[PDB]
Amino acid sequence: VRASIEPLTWENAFFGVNSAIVRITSEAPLLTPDALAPWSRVQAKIAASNTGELDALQQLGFSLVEGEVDLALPVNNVSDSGAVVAQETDIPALRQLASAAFAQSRFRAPWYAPDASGRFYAQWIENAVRGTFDHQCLILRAASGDIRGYVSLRELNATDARIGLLAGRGAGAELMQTALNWAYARGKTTLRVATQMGNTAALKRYIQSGANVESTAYWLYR
Amino acid sequence: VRASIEPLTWENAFFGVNSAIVRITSEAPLLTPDALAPWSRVQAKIAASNTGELDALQQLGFSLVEGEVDLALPVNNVSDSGAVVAQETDIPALRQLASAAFAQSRFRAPWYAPDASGRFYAQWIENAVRGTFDHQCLILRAASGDIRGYVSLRELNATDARIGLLAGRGAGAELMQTALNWAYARGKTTLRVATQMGNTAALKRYIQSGANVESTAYWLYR
Ligand SMILES: [Zn+2]
């Protein structure tokens, strides 16, 4: 395989690691054990259809971390869920929720430190709260005022929005409604959402809501 | 991880290999390098959600071959597709079609010999034709009399049928309708179909026809 190797700038500073990501292309140098040597961690994300790349990377010492499915739904606005835009006072509780809900991610041990995944997703949801009109965390509340669920959303382009994080036991359907509402308000035609291949509950929920598969991928690390 | 190691008798005789499959169970002996060592190939299939088993098997030197998504469709009275039950005289044409269309299964190179996948699936489609009223291959013909698409089906139990093989360019929708009609006719509520994680075209078509995800898995070999 031929591939460039690029430092993961944000993750390196955030995790305190010396990691890089491989980008497979015809025009890059040969990917060799020597090119891979000066890194504490190397990541690669390949199309699940590309078995040629899977075995080239495995032969270089990479291992499967997880599969990813990316899906898309037409928008299609719907029942106002009553969700509200998260405010700065919600950050402590959302960080606590997100670090727990997304504890088992591609940043799991033994690839990263035990606290890495929790930190990463807590930062993600905080970043969405401190976002912009086009990057927000929306919250559904119970009648008590407690957070029942949350969904983070971002504009991708003129037609598309993407769900970042979505979590809330028993609130999947209303969180999807919330996301569809948000995309529609911004004139988007398409809503995208990726999940882990192992997350059959999320896959089922998304497909029930009208989603279909756009792409599938493997994350591999060395 | 505790698992029994069970010889793959049928595959050993068909491919001319000496392989086994792992059966993970709380009751079984410890799965060790010593126990795995003498087999030319060892297979393992684990739920994609089970990262503990993934880590354990990678720590015994297993690699990813492919991801599988198993889906299920509700069965109802769909229209007739015009498909016909394949005959013994259709075998030669079906074997050739199947060997070409299913060359890149989990029986692909480098894990098996280059001809192995096509041999396996040609035998599969042949076996379908030679089956009962509860195992058939159904075909669609173009104007020329040529096979345009095919689908093999079997009854699983009182409520379920399963699609074995399905192929035919531009005949996807019709073949699904064919399979649903077959299942309906036999009093089934549920039609199951597995596909490779990388086969986004099949995933999209199954989901368009009403499928949702039932399970996801990795095939790992050593
Ligand atoms: Zn390896």
Curated annotation (Swiss-Prot), chains A, B:
Top-level taxonomic group: Bacteria
An individual GO BP term: enterobacterial common antigen biosynthetic process
Signal peptide: none
Enzyme class (EC, first level): transferase
One Pfam family here: Acetyltransf_1
EC number(s) per entry: 2.3.1.210
Catalytic activity: dTDP-4-amino-4,6-dideoxy-alpha-D-galactose + acetyl-CoA = dTDP-4-acetamido-4,6-dideoxy-alpha-D-galactose + CoA + H(+)
Gene Ontology MF term list: N-acetyltransferase activity
Keywords for this protein: Acyltransferase, Transferase
Transmembrane regions: none
InterPro entries: AcTrfase_WecD, Acyl_CoA_acyltransferase, Ankyrin_rpt, Bact_Acetyltransf, GNAT_dom
CDD domains: NAT_SF
Function, as annotated: Catalyzes the acetylation of dTDP-fucosamine (dTDP-4-amino-4,6-dideoxy-D-galactose) to dTDP-Fuc4NAc, which is utilized in the biosynthesis of the enterobacterial common antigen (ECA).
Family, as annotated: Belongs to the WecD family.
Name of this protein: dTDP-fucosamine acetyltransferase
Naturally occurring in which organism (per UniProt): Escherichia coli O6:H1 (strain CFT073 / ATCC 700928 / UPEC)
Gene that this polypeptide is encoded by: wecD
